DNA sequence: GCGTCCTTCGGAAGAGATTCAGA
DNA sequence: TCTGAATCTCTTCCAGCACACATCAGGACGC
RNA sequence: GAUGUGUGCU
């Protein structure tokens, strides 16, 4: 049919070609017999007939007159459907300006003529004249003349000189423009001028002129002459109940425009005075402006109720526009909706539909089978029989509903598992029964939520629902390798209560020959479910190549585990149920069942776990009483100790030792420590305090308190909720993220005061107002993440390269948060990995390492695997299967032709939204850690201190004087095992090389107020610190000691902003001291809030504190407050203080001194040395005048900006930095996201690449073009005798890179529809319909999944 | 908001330097607003409606 | 009598080509008069197609060679 | 609530919204990603081309369903033609190539 | 009459429903004793004393 | 009952236009 | 006095689905 | 058909 969409400007000849008539009167339906008016916005002569195959006046009535045009009213008799296809047009008496090319910012008229926007809007809205054809005078071709100046110009130069005004003047300016001469003149100016800002402006105007001269467009078409009208059927005036009509916005706007045009034409026909026609031209221009894009001008007009009405742009742009409301998503027939109930008698491939919903859903199917069997005769007879709900219809419904899967769907569909396909089971009632095993995936609690059903009509839809979207084949979440059908909240409790032991029973020491006799014992009640017996079991093993070899043993187990073994499929080792099965235990059990056996045994076993959990949970009676939450008898001692310590803090801050912010930072510290102590004390008292006799003296066992069962099993609960049920509730947070200074001291089991409840109200409102008002900026994240990765789809089997990111197991301050196994699993290695059996390879070059390979890598203790990443793939418009890895939902390599960009974006974007609508579940607790200020190393081994600049203290111990340090603990083998981050100004009791014993303390510091320290001792002189101007100095009269606080750049005096406080070190003679290594003075700069408690010229020791600066480490650190960081990383925001790097290698030295600020020059020893850099005096330099620096080394300190790290350290370093930071952010809240999705997003970041030099390619010098195009052009040129064009990868944010996508329809549908549509119309772009959203809008097979083969056939056919 | 005079702060996020401004508001029961405010250059600028 | 299609995917390992070939087979079987190679047990045509997939006596190769043979014999039948 | 073939909107040829009106559920913008994620293209194409949007294919599919022939013949969504007309109502020329 | 779910007590911290359940059980026990003492007709002294 | 008509109040960020300073 | 860096100013964006109720559609002025 | 208010689940 078609394979492209072209967008360009509209010519008046082309609009008249679109035009079928000339509307010139604002007459809608005549408030009478409802006929269209003669020459109004609705008319049969202009657009088309009202009723089908009928004339307007009534001269023809049926199809036998089709084609003829009537005589009395001049209308044609044709279909009535063409009223939404046949456009009219308006012949404006005077031209007008189209605002989209006027106020886009960049204003196309503004930079096309190089005259500012203000002058153009003054000219186009009649406040000043403008000059055309200056001629033989001093007036230029673009000069602006006011009224008085224009009058002067006419009284002195009233010759053939012309000076028009308004839209006519602008039209003359654009028509009298020569594109080639301007283009070559600007090219000459670009070649001549050396300044960069004028160069950028000139090259932007050159780009615009090249866009004009390339396409068939011309500059004069941007001023509107004829105004086409929308077809009447798309602006209907529905006849309401009575004589009034609908207040359709477009009709009123067209009425106003036609009013202005007709009045202007009448005034121009009568030769009105020039001021009146000028004012009426202004009115016409503003009316057309309000019709085209209302609200872009100063005031948006309103029709009624003082409400800004919508124009032709408000229904194309925004959240309520056609792109997001009626194109990317539509209301769908054959659908239903009802409240859901449990019905746990179902299976994974079954759902429950109400008997009445299925009769309305599958109604055409019933009609078809009723016509097939001959029970009915025609369609209307079957319709009447269905409406009468005869008994035969109910019988035949069970026939159509048999194996026709439906789409169960919830309202918020966060991820891929929001739509699953089930077979229906017809039941009575009006509720959609749902299988609870998928309720965790759905996040569909049974508290009154509505799900939506959908009926696959065509054959392919049913087969896709059977083979792809079926819930049986969706038991692995796309986020990670963990299963998504995890039993929860009843089955976990049942299994945990069953698979448990206590030392007593009805029968304990007896012996059984298998699970069957254990069941016989438990059913008869001759042995308790928690006995400790020795049954004889027959577990199977598959050591052979797919054959199960038998073995029989006599293991010491319980009765419950023996019963549970009856449902375990043949092939798993018995050492999976011989414990207390919690939630993670059975999750791992299901995972290993899937990994070993497959899919059908896994689903059958999951259903069996469901059944045997529900039955033995019903039989358990695991209730909850008020006698189950036991209050520990030592929590009030802990609150007394914390009260004493905070009373000490009172004296600490009121004296002046610490300030208000520091007091607030320490009080939260001590309250959190007390809360963590009370929680642990209560947990111990509630899990171990039970007494039982084994037929003799008393023995201790794991407690059987109900709350402990449902807090240890993990069915539903954690430490927070139960901790708040007994003992200490803790300290809660305000909606802004700040934490309350006073934690309420009471628990819900004993009660709350009338004031502690008021305090907990803060956290309770925080949770709710955080969910409902900050899940918006987390749904926005996933929206603009799915947008940026929609067009990325697997396209090739193998790209065949050797490039790949370097993969290491990360230890960022604690234990091993994630090992190698959890990190590299299911990803194809990039090269032959070297085991520590060196000179021999362990795993081949291109094997997708599965769980067995992961175990092999864990066995040989390998710590450095080069793995293929999706960001380093070499394919074109997609990524090969080998650079991605496994499907993450199936146990195999991914199939070529699958949309992984969408599953990556959804996986990244819905832990944030999900968990931010979960912060109210724990109540309102801050959940802030204790902020430990010491290092207790546990493992035995040595220390490898990397990049540490330590100095000697007055006590002699090492003190760190660097910011990027990390203390790594490495065991005796030499492999890395631990790594801790020591802070600035921390003292070390140990060093490097010494084998540190396990269980000592090596580093100490103070958590708040990290101190600036000195290298060399001596006397300090108070330089550039005068009281009041830049420092607030307070002094006690009696003692006479200065404890000052410095000012910021905020509250300091405006004149004194050039005064920068610092402490300079001098000797006894006041001479200059030097840093060890260089001859530069010790100028230690002071930041804001720096407190100093010293005196000028005091004797100190080397390596001591000088000043303290508060850190203000305050925040709840939830996913609600704590994830703008992910948005900053993905949109690539430049940090406030970027740490300057070394852009080229070579020796480092200074050049000129104080060119306003410091200067530095890097010179290589072989190549050219044109690199200079500007260094503000804010940051000290970690390098000196006499070392050698390499590319990527940090000259100063601070956060890295995700532009320079890419441009200097390469793609791998920046992608690893982004991956690590996002992974740490998500793992702070326990989320487990596979890194592949993040790498997919980072690859989608890097699509733009600016050209360094043209080379032999056809691209320009500074033009920014797709990296895929550059790679293809370079590969094509390298096949010939030419040379490729050197480039550099850019890094634009997800929003920036999405808005500059090659297919303009995606960007137009996403955001800034006006600014993108105008650019696409100016440039004359041509969409290829390559991605997914474009084919969604068009309505074809998306080239993503099952339609990928069809798209390949359609592409290769041409 | 009760009619009267209100001395708002607009602390923080303005001027990208932390420089606290100070704006005085006189909200009438029925009439025009009389917003006084400062400037980053320590100028006191009035702004009505 | 159908719960999952894992065996069928093990037969043809694409998970997407399977849907297309099953759709083609069921379209042949439903609107036309082509008889199933496996005796149906009062099931919808989709799972008869899938059951033909899993026993291995059908694929894209078998279907298009059979269709080419049928086209050849019907065009030769005109004589 | 449930909905077979029924009433349709006027400005766009889509099913109505609500329960008082015999209207169907909304397979919204977030819903389509959940189908592109699976790769189930044909079912998505029915949910926004032949089942809701278009006019000729809407009746053709109904006839096919009550004829024993489960097959879909997609045309063009009417809501896309609405977008084309509303863009051409401006000074912009959007069109379909050959 | 109603078989609820115990796990709705701890995770959503509405412990007051357990205390309401206990107090309602006590109230219905007192009502049941009153009903029993009223079923077989005893003099007003016993009912007033209870 | 007909019938025709001419208030302010968000805020986080990006971009494009001014001002500053500074050598 | 030209030209980068800083600041001023204008625009864009802000979750999804569903349900219920109400009003409203020129309303002012002449006939 | 659009606005206004209230409400449910996230
Ligand atoms: Mg819920
Ligand atoms: Zn006629
Ligand atoms: Zn690749």
The domains of chain C are located at: 1-79
Which positions ≥6 away from A875 have C-beta within 8 Å?
A795, A796, A799, A883
Pairing outcome for strands A511-512 and A533-537: parallel
Distance A795 CA to ligand 3 centre (A): 10
User: B-chain residues within 8 Å CB-CB of A738?
Assistant: none
- How do A958-960 and A987-988 pair as beta strands? antiparallel
E runs forming strands in A857-941:
865-866, 879-880, 934-937
SS3 state of residue A1014: coil
**Alpha carbon A784 to chain centroid distance?**
7
User: In terms of C-beta density within 10 A (0-12 exposed, 13-18 middle, 19 or more buried), how is residue A1193 classed?
Assistant: middle
* C-alpha span between A147 and A79 (Å, rounded): 56
Of all ligands present, the nearest one to the C-alpha of A74 is 2
Considering CB atoms only, which of E10, E12, E19 is closest to A707? E10
Q: Does the annotation list A445 as a binding residue?
A: yes
Q: Which conformational region is residue A433 in: left (phi greater than 0), alpha (psi within -120 to 50 degrees), or beta? A: beta
Bridge partners (DSSP) listed for residue D93: A8
CA distance C47 to C8: 11
Strand G: which positions are within 7 A of a protein CB? 2-5, 7-8, 10-21, 24-27
CA distance D17 to chain C (A): 33
- Could you tell me the end-to-end alpha-carbon distance of chain B, in angstroms, rounded to an integer? 17
Location of structure tokens 């029924």: D6
Q: How many CB atoms lie within 10 A of CB A993?
A: 10
Residues 1290-1349 (A) near nucleic chain F, CB < 7 A: 1293, 1296
Cα of B32 to nearest chain A Cα, Å: 19
d(CA A289, CA A301): 10
The angle at the Cα of A872, spanning A866 to A875, to the nearest 5 degrees, equals: 130
Does the CB of A1054 have a partner CB in chain B at under 8 Å? yes
Total number of residues shown for chain C: 79
**C-alpha dihedral, A405 to A406 to A410 to A413, nearest 10°:** 70
Contact criterion met (CB below 8 Å) for A495 and A467: no
- Give A1289-1312 as a DSSP string: E----HHHHHHT-SSHHHHHHHS-
Tell me whether residue A55 is annotated as binding. Answer: yes
Collect all residues with Cβ–Cβ distance below 8 Å to A275 and sequence separation of at least 6.
none
Q: What is the Cα–Cα distance from A671 to A130, expressed in whole angstroms?
A: 72
Å separating the CA of residue A31 from the C1' of nucleotide F3: 10
A1051 touches chain B (CB under 8 A): yes
* Token pair belonging to A449: 């939520």
Ligand nearest to the CA of A70: 2
Classify residue A1010 as left (phi > 0), alpha (psi -120 to 50) or beta.
Answer: beta
- Name, in order, each residue with C-beta under 8 angstroms of A558's C-beta and a sequence gap of 6 or more: A499, A500, A501, A529, A530, A531, A532, A533
Asked if A368 reaches chain C (Cβ–Cβ under 8 Å), the answer is no
Identify, with chain letter, the residue nearest to nucleotide G16 (CA–C1').
Answer: A412
Q: Do E10 and A489 touch (CB under 8 A)?
A: no
With a CB cutoff of 8 Å and minimum separation 6, the contacts of A192 are none
Q: Which of A550, A525, A698, A725 is nearest to A631 (CA)?
A: A725
Between CA A985 and CA A992, with CA A991 as vertex, the angle to 5 degrees is 125
* A455, D61 Cβ separation under 8 angstroms: no
Helices first, then strands: H and E counts in chain A = 40, 49
Euclidean distance between CA atoms A197 and A181, whole angstroms? 22
Query: Which of D78, D57, D74 minimizes the C-alpha distance to D5?
Result: D57
Which residues, other chains included, contact A264 with Cβ-Cβ below 8 Å and sequence gap of 6+?
A93, A94, A277, A280, A281, A283, A284
Question: Which residues neighbour strand H (beta carbon < 7 Å)?
Answer: A 238, 246-247, 305, 307, 320, 411-412, 443, 445, 447-450, 771-772, 914, 917-918; D 9-11, 16
Distance from CA of C79 to the nearest CA of D (A): 32
Q: How far apart are CA A924 and CA A1121, in angstroms?
A: 13
Tell me how far the alpha carbon of residue A1227 lies from the centroid of ligand 3, in angstroms.
Answer: 28
Alpha-carbon distance A165 to A1144, whole Å?
A: 56
Cα–Cα distance measured from residue A558 to residue A564, given in angstroms and rounded to the nearest whole number: 10
Query: DSSP label at A234?
Result: G
Bridge pairing between strands A335-341 and D2-3: antiparallel
Question: Which stretch of DSSP H or E encloses residue A708?
Answer: helix A706-712
Spatial CA neighbour of A327 closest among D10, B19, D2, D13: D13
Residue nearest to nucleotide G11 (CA to C1'): A105
Across the interface, whether the CB atoms of C45 and A603 are under 8 A apart is answered no
Question: Cα torsion at A264, A267, A271, A277 (round to 10°)?
Answer: -50
Burial tier of A278 (Cβ tally within 10 Å: 0-12, 13-18, 19+): middle
Closest residue on chain D to C19 (Cα)? D40
* Helix, strand and coil percent figures for chain A, each rounded to 5: 35, 15, 50
Q: Is the peptide bond before A134 cis (omega within 30 degrees of 0)?
A: no
- A1126, with CB counted inside 10 A (0-12, 13-18, 19+), is buried
Q: How far apart are CA A1277 and CA A1291, in angstroms?
A: 26
Taking the C-alpha atoms of residue D61 and residue D59, their distance in angstroms, rounded to an integer, is 5
Q: How far is CA A678 from CA A529, A718, A936, D89, E14, in A?
A: 34, 15, 22, 70, 21
Q: Which residues contact A173 (CB under 8 A, 6 or more apart)?
A: A113, A130, A132, A142
Q: Which nucleotide is nearest to A412 (CA to C1')?
A: G16
Contacts of A1338 in chain D (CB under 8 A): 76, 80
**Cα(A462)–Cα(A469) distance, integer angstroms:** 10
C1' of G12 to CA of A141 (Å): 36
CA of B12 to C1' of F10 (A): 14
- Hey, what are E16's tokens? 């007051």
Q: Which nucleotides of H are covered by protein (CB under 7 A)?
A: 1, 3, 8-10
Helix ranges (H only) for A789-884 are 820-824, 851-859
Tokens of A921: 């579940």
Documented resolution in Å: 3.9
Strand partners, A845: none
| Rounded Cα gap, residues A1173 and A1160, in angstroms | 6
Per-residue b/e over A64-83, b at no fewer than 16 CB within 10 Å? eeeeeebeebebbbbebeeb
| CA distance readout (Å), A168 to A116, A127, A278, A1243, B46 | 18, 14, 12, 50, 41
- Give the Å distances, CA to CA, from A488 to A593, A710, A716, E7: 18, 11, 7, 11
Sequence-distant (6+) residues with CB within 8 A of C7 are C54
A351 is in an annotated binding site: no
Closest Cα partner for A409 from E39, D24, E4?
D24
Report how far residue A622's alpha carbon sits from residue A705's, in angstroms, rounded to the nearest whole number: 9
Method: cryo-EM
How far apart, in whole angstroms, are the C-alpha atoms of residue A344 and residue A315?
Answer: 47
Look at residues A137, A105, A141 and name the one whose alpha carbon lies nearest to residue A121: A105
Length of chain B: 49
Pairwise CA distance, residues A342 & E5, whole Å: 13
Nearest to A462 among C16, C20, C46 (CB): C46
Alpha carbon distance A94, A266 (integer Å): 12
CA quadruple A293, A295, A301, A305: dihedral sign: positive
Task: Name residue, tokens 């063009």.
Answer: D76
- What is the maximum span of chain A, computed from C-alpha positions, in angstroms? 126
Residues sharing a CB contact under 8 Å with residue A65, sequence separation 6 or more, in sequence order:
A55, A77
Token pair of A685 as six digits: 């008292």
| Pairing mode, strands A1083-1085 and D92-96 | unpaired
> If you write DSSP's letter for every residue of A486-554 in order, what string do you get?
---SSHHHHHHHHS---S--SS-S-EESSHHHHHHHHHHTSS-TT--EEEEE--EE--SSS-PEE--EE
Q: Which chain B residues are closer than 8 Å to A1050 by Cβ? A: 17-20
How many Å apart are CA A131 and CA C67, to the nearest integer? 76
Residue A1050 CB contacts under 8 Å (≥ 6 apart), including other chains: B17, B18, B19, B20
**Whether A748 and E6 lie within 8 Å, measured CB to CB:** no
Q: Say if residue A73 carries a ligand binding annotation.
A: yes
Which ligand lies nearest the alpha carbon of A44?
A: 2
Angle between helices D29-36 and A900-909 (to 10 degrees): 130
Q: For residues A230 and A90, give the distance between their C-alpha atoms in angstroms, rounded to a whole number.
A: 11
Mutate to test the interface with C, among D70, D72, D73 (most CBs of C within 10 A): D70
Q: In 10 A of CB A168, how many CB atoms?
A: 14
Give me the DSSP letters along B1-49: --SEEEEE---SSSTTT-----EEEEE-SSS---EEEE-TTS-EEEE--
Give CA separation, A918 vs A450, A1118, A1132, in Å. 19, 10, 28
Q: Are the C-beta atoms of A1108 and A901 separated by less than 8 Å?
A: no
Cα–Cα distance, A411 to A413 (Å, whole number): 6
Give the closest residue to A1303 by CA, choosing from A1341, A1338, A1352.
A1338
Which of C16, C23, C30 is closest, CB to CB, to D39?
A: C16
Q: How far is Cα of residue A1045 from the mean position of the Cα atoms in its chain?
A: 41
Q: Does A732 touch chain E (CB under 8 A)?
A: no
Q: What is the DSSP letter of A31?
A: S
- DSSP output for A1315-1352: HHHHHHHHHT-EE---SSHHHHHHTS--TTSTTHHHHH
Cα separation, A469 vs A1160, in Å, equals 61
* Residue spans per domain, chain D: 14-98
Task: Let me know: does A218 contact A85? Beta carbons within 8 Å.
Answer: no
Give the tokens for residue A1326: 């041509």
DSSP A1061: -
Please give the C-alpha separations between residue A1282 and each of A431, A881, A1256, A1286, in angstroms, as whole numbers.
70, 32, 6, 13
Give the domain range for residue A655.
Answer: 634-770
């Amino acid at each position: 049919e078609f394979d492209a969409i072209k967008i360009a400007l509209a010519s008046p000849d082309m609009i008249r070609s679109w035009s079928f008539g000339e509307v010139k009167k604002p007459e809608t339906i005549n408030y009478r017999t409802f006929k269209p008016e003669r020459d109004g916005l609705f008319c049969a002569r202009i657009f088309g007939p009202v009723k089908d195959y009928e004339c307007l006046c009534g001269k023809y009535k049926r199809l036998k007159h089709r084609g003829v045009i009537c005589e009395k009213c001049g209308v044609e008799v044709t279909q009535t459907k063409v009223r939404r296809e046949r456009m009219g047009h308006i012949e404006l008496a005077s031209p007008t300006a189209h605002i989209w090319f006027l106020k886009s910012l960049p204003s196309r008229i503004g930079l096309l003529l190089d005259m500012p926007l203000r002058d153009i809007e003054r000219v186009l809205y009649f406040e000043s004249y403008v000059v055309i054809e200056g001629g033989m005078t001093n007036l230029e071709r673009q000069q602006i003349l006011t009224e008085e100046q224009y009058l002067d110009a006419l009284e002195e130069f009233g010759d053939e000189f012309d000076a028009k005004m308004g839209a006519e003047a602008i039209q003359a300016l654009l028509k009298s423009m020569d594109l080639e001469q301007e283009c070559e003149q600007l090219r000459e100016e670009l070649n001549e001028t050396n300044s960069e800002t004028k160069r950028k402006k000139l090259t932007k105007r050159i780009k615009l002129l090249e866009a004009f001269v390339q396409s068939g467009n011309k500059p004069e078409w941007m001023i509107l002459t004829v105004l086409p009208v929308l077809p009447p059927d798309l602006r209907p005036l529905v006849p309401l109940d009575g004589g009034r009509f609908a207040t359709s916005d477009l009709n009123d706007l067209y009425r106003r425009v036609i009013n202005r045009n007709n009045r202007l034409k009448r005034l121009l026909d009568l030769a009105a005075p020039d001021i009146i026609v000028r004012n009426e031209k202004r009115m016409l221009q503003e009316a057309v402006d309000a019709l085209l894009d209302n609200g872009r001008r100063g005031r948006a007009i309103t029709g009624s109720n003082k409400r800004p009405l919508k124009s032709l742009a408000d229904m194309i742009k925004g959240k309520q526009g056609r792109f997001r409301q009626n194109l990317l998503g539509k209301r769908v027939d054959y659908s239903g909706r009802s409240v859901i109930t449990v019905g746990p008698y179902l299976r994974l491939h079954q759902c429950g539909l109400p008997k009445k919903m299925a009769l309305e859903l599958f109604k055409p199917f019933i009609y078809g089978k009723l016509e097939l069997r001959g029970l009915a005769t025609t369609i209307k007879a079957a319709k009447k029989m269905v409406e009468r709900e005869e008994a035969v219809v109910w019988d035949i419904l069970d026939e159509v509903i048999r194996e026709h899967p439906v789409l169960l769907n919830r309202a918020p569909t966060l991820h891929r598992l929001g739509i699953q396909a089930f077979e229906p089971v017809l039941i009575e009632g009006k509720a959609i029964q749902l299988h609870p095993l998928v309720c965790a995936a759905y996040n569909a609690d049974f508290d009154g939520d509505q799900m939506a059903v959908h009926v696959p009509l065509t054959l392919e839809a049913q087969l896709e629902a059977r083979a792809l979207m079926m819930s049986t084949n969706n038991i692995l979440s796309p986020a990670n390798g963990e299963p998504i059908i995890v039993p929860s909240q009843d089955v976990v409790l049942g299994l945990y209560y069953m698979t448990r032991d206590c030392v007593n029973a009805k029968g304990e020491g007896m012996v059984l020959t298998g699970p069957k006799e254990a069941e016989r014992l438990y059913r008869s009640g001759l042995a308790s479910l928690h006995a400790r017996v020795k049954v004889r079991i027959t577990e199977y093993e598959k050591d052979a190549n797919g054959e199960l070899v038998a073995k029989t043993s006599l293991k010491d187990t319980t009765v419950g585990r023996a019963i549970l073994w009856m449902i375990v499929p043949k092939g798993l080792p018995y050492s999976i149920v011989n414990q207390a099965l919690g939630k993670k235990a059975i999750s791992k059990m299901l995972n290993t069942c899937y990994r070993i056996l497959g899919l059908k045994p896994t689903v059958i076993f999951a259903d069996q776990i469901m059944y045997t959990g529900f039955a033995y949970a019903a039989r358990s009676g695991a209730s909850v009483g008020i006698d189950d939450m036991v209050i520990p008898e030592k929590k009030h001692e802990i609150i007394s100790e914390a009260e004493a310590e905070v009373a000490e803090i009172q004296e600490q801050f009121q004296s002046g030792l610490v300030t208000a912010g520091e007091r607030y930072n320490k009080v939260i510290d001590i309250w959190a420590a007390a809360n963590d102590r009370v929680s642990k004390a209560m947990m111990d008292n509630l899990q171990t305090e039970t007494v039982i006799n084994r037929d003799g003296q008393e023995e201790k066992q794991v407690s059987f308190n109900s709350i402990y069962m449902m807090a240890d099993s993990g069915a539903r609960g954690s430490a927070a909720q139960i901790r708040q049920l007994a003992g200490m509730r803790g300290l809660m947070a305000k909606p802004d993220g700040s934490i309350i200074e006073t934690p309420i001291t009471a628990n819900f089991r004993e009660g709350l005061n009338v004031l502690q409840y008021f305090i907990s109200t803060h956290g309770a409102r925080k949770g709710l107002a955080d969910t409902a008002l900050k899940t918006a900026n987390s749904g926005y994240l996933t929206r603009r993440l799915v947008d940026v990765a929609q067009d990325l789809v697997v396209t090739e089997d193998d790209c065949g390269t050797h490039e790949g990111i370097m993969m290491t197991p990360v230890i960022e301050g604690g234990d091993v948060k994630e090992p190698l196994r959890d990190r590299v699993l299911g990803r194809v290695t990039a090269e032959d990995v070297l085991k520590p059996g060196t000179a021999d390879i362990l795993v081949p070059r291109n094997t997708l390492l599965h769980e067995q390979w992961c175990d092999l890598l864990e066995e040989n203790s390998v710590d450095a695997v080069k793995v293929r990443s999706v960001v380093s793939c070499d394919t074109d418009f997609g990524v090969c299967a080998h650079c991605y890895g496994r499907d993450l939902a199936r146990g195999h390599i991914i199939n070529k032709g699958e949309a992984i960009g969408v599953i990556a974006a959804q996986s990244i974007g819905e832990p944030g939204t999900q968990l931010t609508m979960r912060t109210f579940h724990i109540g309102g607790a801050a959940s802030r850690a204790a902020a430990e200020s010491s290092i207790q190393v546990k493992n035995k081994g040595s220390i490898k201190l990397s990049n540490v600049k330590s100095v000697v203290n007055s006590s002699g111990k090492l003190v760190i004087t660097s910011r990027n340090t990390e203390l790594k603990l490495i065991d005796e083998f030499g492999r890395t095992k631990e790594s801790y981050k020591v802070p600035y100004g921390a003292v070390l009791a140990k060093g490097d090389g010494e084998q540190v014993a396990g269980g000592e303390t090596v580093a100490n510091w103070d958590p708040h107020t990290m101190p600036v320290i000195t290298e060399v001792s001596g006397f300090v002189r108070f330089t550039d610190m005068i009281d009041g101007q830049t420092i607030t100095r307070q002094t006690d009269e009696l003692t006479g000691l200065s404890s000052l606080v410095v000012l910021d750049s905020a509250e300091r005096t405006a004149g004194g902003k050039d005064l920068r406080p610092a402490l300079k070190i001098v000797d006894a003679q006041g001479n200059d001291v030097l840093i060890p290594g260089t001859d530069m003075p010790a100028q230690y700069f002071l930041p804001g809030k720096a407190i100093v408690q010293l005196e000028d010229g005091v004797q100190i020791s080397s390596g001591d504190t000088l000043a303290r600066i508060p850190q203000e480490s305050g925040g709840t650190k939830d996913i609600t407050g704590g994830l703008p960081r992910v948005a900053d990383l993905f949109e690539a925001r430049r940090p406030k203080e970027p740490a300057i790097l070394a852009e080229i290698s070579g020796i480092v030295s200074f050049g000129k001194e104080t060119k306003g600020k410091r200067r530095l020059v890097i010179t290589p020893v072989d190549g050219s040395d044109p690199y200079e850099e500007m260094i503000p005096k804010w940051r000290q330099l970690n390098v000196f005048e006499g070392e050698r620096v390499e590319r990527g080394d940090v000259i100063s300190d601070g956060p890295e900006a995700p532009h320079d790290i890419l441009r200097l350290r390469g793609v791998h370093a920046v992608t690893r930095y982004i991956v690590n930071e996002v992974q740490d952010v998500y793992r702070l809240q326990g989320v487990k996201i596979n890194d592949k999705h993040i790498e997919v997003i980072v690859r989608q970041m890097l699509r733009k690449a600016t050209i360094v030099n043209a080379g032999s390619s056809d691209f320009l010098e500074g033009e920014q073009v797709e990296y895929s195009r550059v790679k293809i052009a370079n590969r094509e040129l390298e096949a010939n005798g030419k040379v490729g064009a050197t480039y550099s990868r850019d890094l634009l944010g997800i929003t920036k890179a999405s808005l500059a996508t090659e297919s303009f329809i995606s960007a137009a549908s996403f955001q800034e529809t006006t600014r993108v549509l105008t650019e696409a119309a100016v440039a004359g772009k041509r969409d290829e319909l390559r991605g997914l959203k474009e084919n969604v809008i068009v309505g074809r097979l998306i080239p993503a999944g099952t339609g990928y083969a069809y798209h390949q056939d359609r592409m290769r056919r041409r | 908001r009760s009619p009267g005079v209100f001395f708002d702060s607009d602390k923080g996020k303005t001027h990208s330097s932390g420089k606290v401004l100070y704006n005085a508001r006189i909200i009438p029961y029925r009439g025009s607003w009389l917003d006084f405010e400062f400037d980053p250059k320590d100028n006191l600028f009035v702004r009505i409606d | 009598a159908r719960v999952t299609v894992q065996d069928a995917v093990e037969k043809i390992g694409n998970r997407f080509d399977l849907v297309l070939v099953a759709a083609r087979r069921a379209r042949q079987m439903q609107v036309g008069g082509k008889d199933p190679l496996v005796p149906e047990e009062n099931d919808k045509t989709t799972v008869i197609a899938l059951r033909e997939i899993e026993e291995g006596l059908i694929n894209n190769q078998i279907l298009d060679v059979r269709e080419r043979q049928e086209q050849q014999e019907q065009e030769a039948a005109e004589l | 609530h449930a909905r077979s073939t029924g009433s349709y909107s006027l400005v766009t040829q889509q099913p109505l919204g609500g329960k008082a009106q015999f209207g169907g559920q909304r397979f919204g913008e977030m819903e389509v990603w959940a189908l592109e994620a699976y790769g189930a293209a044909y079912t998505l194409q029915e949910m926004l081309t032949v089942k809701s949007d278009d006019v000729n294919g809407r009746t053709k599919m109904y006839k096919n369903i009550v004829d024993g022939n489960h097959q879909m013949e997609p045309g063009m969504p009417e809501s896309f033609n609405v977008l084309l007309k509303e863009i051409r109502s401006l000074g912009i020329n959007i069109e379909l190539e050959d | 009459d109603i078989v609820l779910n115990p796990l709705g007590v701890p995770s959503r911290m509405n412990i007051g429903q357990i205390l309401e359940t206990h107090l309602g059980m006590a109230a219905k026990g007192i009502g049941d004793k009153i009903n029993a003492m009223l079923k077989q007709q005893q003099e007003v002294a016993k009912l007033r004393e209870f």
